[PDB]
Amino acid sequence: GIVEQCCTSICSLYQLENYCN
Amino acid sequence: FVNQHLCGSHLVEALYLVCGERG
Q1: Which of A11, B6, B14, B21 has the fewest C-beta atoms under 10 angstroms from its C-beta?
Q2: Which residues cross the membrane (chain B)?
């Protein structure tokens, strides 16, 4: 989930933006 | 060095920036 994508790995601005709810 | 990982409170802060509505 977001921890794997943005914390364990580096994620882009658009990847983080997709997590917005 | 610049840490590009976003973990814990820093992830929450980045989501507040990115997703928060503010012109």
Answers
A1: B21
A2: none
The amino acid at residue B16 is: Y
By residue count, chain B amounts to 23
Write out the two tokens for A15: 């990847």
Q: Where are the alpha helices (DSSP H) in chain B?
A: 9-19
Task: Say whether B6 and A21 touch across the interface (CB within 8 A).
Answer: no
Calculate how close chain B gets to A15, using CA atoms only, in Å. Answer: 11
Among the partner-chain residues B7, B18, B19, the one whose CB lies closest to the CB of A7 is B7
CA B1 to chain centre: 18
